[PDB]
C-alpha cells in the first residue's frame, strides 16, 4: 500500500543502526503516523501475498481472551509458536489484558466490553481506550506487547481507531497489525451500527530487521494494486461471537509472497 | 510555535462539533503528530506567555509520586484545584502510577527508576515505557490520565521521547504538556549522560473548547518567536532531586498571556 511503502522507504532513508535483545540488529526510526480510510478499501498489503487466515484467527483468539496457542494450532496458524512454553502458554498477553485486566483489589476488567458499551452509550467520550500494557504483568508475558494501546473515536456516524505500536517489525509484523486492527474496526462498527472511519497507526521504535533488507527492496520495486474489499456476511449477537467464515475478502490480487525469517 | 499554530488552525478548519462530558462542547479532530527537535530550542509556546512555574512544579510533583495538591499550593500552583477532593487528593493519578504502579499481588514497580536503569544499562531497548493508564485504578482517579503513555528511545547518543495524549485541550493543556515532557527529556538526558533528541507528540481526541474560540483567533493572529533555551544550573544526585531553582529559561520573549476558562 502507498502508506506502507512510504514508511519502508522512510526507515531506509532516515533510520539508525541499532543492536537489540535478539542480537540480529535493526535499522530504526522513532515516531511515525499514517492513516487508512477504511472506506477506500481493506488495508491488506498487496505488494506481497499476506496470510489473511492467520490474521483473522489471531484476532478471534484475542477476542476470546485466550493466550495459549492450542486454538491457533487447531486452525493451522503457527505465528506464535516460537514464544510459547512447553504447554503452549504465552502468559497474560493481549487476549488476557483485553478481556480480563487484573486490578490490585481482585477485580478483572473486560476492556472490550467496556469500549463497546462506551461506543453505544457515550460515543463522544474521550476515554474509549484499550491497553495491553499492564506494567505489573509484563514479567509474566512471553513477549512484551507490541500493539500496546488503542483508542476509538466517533464522528459523522463513523468509527475510527488509533493504535500506538511501541515496537514494529515493518516487514513481517506491520502488515498483520494493520489488517488486524482494520478488521476489529469493521467488527466493532457492525456491533455499534456505525460506518467505518479511519485506522490511524502510530509507531514508536519502528524498524526493519537487518536480515529483511533484500526482501524490503524487492517489495519496494513493486506497484501497489487496488485494495481488496471486506464483506461481513452475518451480524452476530456480540463482538465475541464471530466465526472465521463470517468474513470474505474480495478482489485481493497481490504480488507474490516474499519469505523472511522472524527474529525470536 | 509553527506546528502548534498549524494544529490550532487545523482543528478550526476540520474539527467536528462534539457534546462532551461537561456539556460545554468542543471542536475536535482525531489523530495528529508533531515533532520537536530539542536541539533547535526549548518548545515553550511564544504566541502567549506560558506559566513555567506551574509547569515545573507539576513535573517535580509527578516525580515525587505525589497526588495531593498540598505541594502545589505550597508553591502557589493552582492548576489542579478544580478536581481535588476536600483533603486535596486526586486519587492514584500520574505521580502514583509513575513511581509505584501496584501489581495484582501487592508489589510495586517504580516506572521512573526502571526507565533510568534501562537508559543506563539497556539503551537500545524497545520497551522503555511509562504508562499512567492503569485500567484497574481509573475509577479511583479524579480525572482519567490525559498524557497516558510515553516511550523513550536512544540513537546516536541522543534521548528522544514520544507521548500518546489521548485527550488534548489544545489551547490550555497542550502548551503545558509539550513543555513538561521536553523538560523531563532534558532531566533524564542529564542523569544518563545523553544529549537531547526529539520530543514526539501524538494526540488522540484533540480539541478546542467552544469557549476558547476568541482566544484561539487572537493567538492565531500572532507570529511565533524564536524558541528559548533551557539551562539546568546544577546536576542533582538523581532524577528525583531537582528543584525549581535548577531551571532557567533563557531568551523567552513571548507575546502577552491570554486568559481562558477551564472546563471542569
Ligand atoms: C504482527 C503480528 C503477529 N505475529 C506475532 C509476532 C510475534 C513475534 C514477532 N517477533 C518479531 N521479531 N517480529 C514480528 O513481527 C513478530 C510477530 C506474527 C508473527 C510472525 C509472522 C510471520 O512470520 N509471518 C510470515 C509467515 C506467515 C505464515 O505463517 O504463513 C509472513 O511471511 O508473513 C507474522 C505475524
Ligand atoms: C496540561 C496540563 C496541566 N493542567 C492539568 C489540567 C487538568 C484539567 C484540565 N481540564 C481541561 N478541560 N483542560 C485542561 O487542559 C486541563 C488541564 C492544567 C490545568 C489548568 C491550566 C490553566 O488553567 N492554565 C491557565 C492559567 C495558569 C495559571 O494558573 O496561571 C493558563 O492561562 O495557561 C493549565 C494546566
Ligand atoms: C511484536 C508483535 C506484533 O504484533 N507486532 C510486531 O511488529 N512485533 C515485533 C516488534 C519487534 O520486532 C518484535 C518484538 O521485540 P521487542 O519486544 O520489541 O524486543 O516483534
Ligand atoms: C487533561 C490534563 C492534561 O494534562 N492535558 C489535557 O489537555 N487535558 C485536558 C483534555 C480534556 O480537555 C480534559 C480532560 O477531559 P476528558 O477526561 O478528556 O473528558 O483535560
| Domains annotated on chain B, with CATH | 2-264 (3.30.572.10)
If you write DSSP's letter for every residue of A187-224 in order, what string do you get?
HHHHHTT-EEEEEEEEEEEEEEEGGGHHHHHHHHTSPP
**CB proximity under 8 Å: B 115-134 to A:** 124-127, 129, 131, 133-134
**CA atoms of A24 and A191, how far apart (whole Å):** 42
Burial class (CB in 10 A: 0-12, 13-18, 19+), A97: buried
Query: Quick check: A36 and A198 in contact, CB under 8 A?
Result: yes
Check if the beta carbon of residue A190 is closer than 8 Å to that of residue A153: no
C-alpha A145/C-alpha A229 separation (Å) is 29
Beta pairing class for A26-37 and B247-250: unpaired
CB of B39 within 8 A of CB of B51?
no
Q: Does any CB of chain B come closer than 8 Å to the CB of residue A110?
A: no
Q: Which residues of B are catalytic?
A: 146
Contacts of A102 in chain B (CB under 8 A): 104, 136
Q: How far apart are CA B90 and CA A230, in angstroms?
A: 45
Q: How far apart are CA B131 and CA B23, in angstroms?
A: 29
3-state secondary structure of A241: coil
List CB contacts (< 8 A) between B32 and chain A: 33
CB contact under 8 A, A135 and B136: no
Residue A101's DSSP bridge partners are: A109
Per the CB < 8 Å rule, is A126 touching B156? no
* DSSP β-bridge partners for residue B249: B230
- Partners of residue B16 on adjacent β-strands: B28
Output helix, strand, coil percentages for chain A, rounded to the nearest 5: 35, 25, 40
Nearest to B79 by CA among B164, B163, B179: B179
Joined together, the cell numbers standing for residue A68 give 495459549
Torsion angle of alpha carbons B237, B239, B241, B246, nearest 10°? 100
Instruction: Please state how this structure was obtained.
Output: X-ray
Ligand 3 center to A170 CA (angstroms): 9
Taking the alpha carbons at both ends of chain B, their separation in whole angstroms is 27
Taking phi over 0 as left and psi of -120 to 50 as alpha, with beta for the rest, B65 belongs to left
List the single best residue of A123, A125, A164 to mutate versus B (max B Cβ within 10 A).
A164
- Answer for the pair B178, B165: CB distance below 8 angstroms, yes or no: no
Residue B149 Cα to ligand 1 midpoint, Å, equals: 25
Distance CA B205, CA B163 (A): 14
Residue with grid cell 476558562, as numbered in its chain: B261
Nearest CA in chain A to B16: A155
Residue A42 · residue A56 · CB < 8 Å:
no
The verdict on B107 touching A (C-beta cutoff 8 Å) is yes
At a CB cut-off of 8 Å and minimum separation 6, what does A177 contact?
A146, A147, A163, A165, A168, A201
Question: Is the CB of residue B101 less than 8 Å from the CB of residue B111?
Answer: yes
- Give dist(CA A105, CA A85) in Å, integer: 29
Q: At what angle do helices B173-191 and B52-64 cross, to 10 degrees?
A: 60
The alpha carbon of B81 and the centre of ligand 2 are apart by a number of angstroms equal to 10
What is the Cα–Cα distance from B161 to B35, expressed in whole angstroms? 10
Exposure letters A80-94 (e unless 16+ CB within 10 A, then b):
beebbeeeebbbbbb
Q: Comparing C-alpha atoms, which of A45, A14, A40, A46 is closest to residue A27?
A: A14
DSSP labels for A90-115? Answer: --S-HHHHHHHEEPTTS-EE-HHHHH
Q: How far apart are CA B129 and CA B151, in angstroms?
A: 4
SS3 A10: helix
Using CA positions, which residue lies closest to atom 32 of ligand 1? A259
The owner of cell 542529564 is B190
Interchain proximity A151–B33, CB inside 8 Å: no
Cβ neighbours for A56, distance < 8 A, ≥ 6 positions apart: A183, A244, A247
Contacts of B86 (CB under 8 A, 6+ apart): none
* DSSP H helices in A103-200: 111-121, 173-191
Count of CB atoms within 10 A of residue B30's CB?
24
Q: Is A168 known to be catalytic?
A: no
Core vs surface per residue A205-220: b (16+ CB within 10 A) or e: bbbbbeebeebbeebe
Residue length of chain A? 264
Resolution rounded to one decimal, in angstroms: 1.3
Question: Taking Cα atoms as reference points, which of B78, B60, B42 lies closest to residue B178?
Answer: B42
Amino acid at each position: 500500500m502507498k502508506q506502507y511503502l512510504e514508511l519502508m522507504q522512510k526507515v531506509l532513508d532516515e533510520g539508525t543502526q541499532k543492536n537489540d535483545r535478539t542480537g540480529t540488529g535493526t535499522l530504526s526510526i522513532f515516531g511515525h503516523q499514517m492513516r487508512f480510510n477504511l472506506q477506500d478499501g481493506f488495508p491488506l498489503v498487496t505488494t506481497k501475498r499476506c496470510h489473511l487466515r492467520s490474521i483473522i484467527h489471531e484476532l478471534l483468539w484475542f477476542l476470546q481472551g485466550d493466550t495459549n496457542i492450542a486454538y491457533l494450532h487447531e486452525n493451522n496458524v503457527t505465528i506464535w509458536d516460537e514464544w510459547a512454553d512447553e504447554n503452549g502458554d504465552l502468559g497474560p498477553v493481549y487476549g488476557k489484558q483485553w478481556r480480563a485486566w487484573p486490578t490490585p483489589d481482585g477485580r478483572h476488567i473486560d476492556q472490550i466490553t467496556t469500549v463497546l458499551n462506551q461506543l453505544k452509550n457515550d460515543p463522544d467520550s474521550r476515554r474509549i481506550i484499550v491497553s495491553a500494557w499492564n506494567v505489573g504483568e509484563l514479567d509474566k508475558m512471553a513477549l512484551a506487547p507490541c500493539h500496546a494501546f488503542f483508542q476509538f473515536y466517533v464522528a459523522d456516524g463513523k468509527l475510527s481507531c488509533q493504535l500506538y505500536q511501541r515496537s514494529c517489525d515493518v516487514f513481517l509484523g506491520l502488515p498483520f497489525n494493520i489488517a488486524s486492527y482494520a478488521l476489529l474496526v469493521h467488527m466493532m462498527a457492525q456491533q455499534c451500527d456505525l460506518e467505518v472511519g479511519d485506522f490511524v497507526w502510530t509507531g514508536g521504535d519502528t524498524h526493519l530487521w537487518s536480515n529483511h533488507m533484500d526482501q524490503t527492496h524487492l517489495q519496494l520495486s513493486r506497484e501497489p494494486r487496488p485494495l481488496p474489499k471486506l464483506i461481513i456476511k452475518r451480524k452476530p449477537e456480540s463482538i465475541f461471537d464471530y466465526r472465521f467464515e463470517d468474513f470474505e475478502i474480495e478482489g485481493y490480487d497481490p504480488h507474490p509472497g516474499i519469505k523472511a525469517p522472524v527474529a525470536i
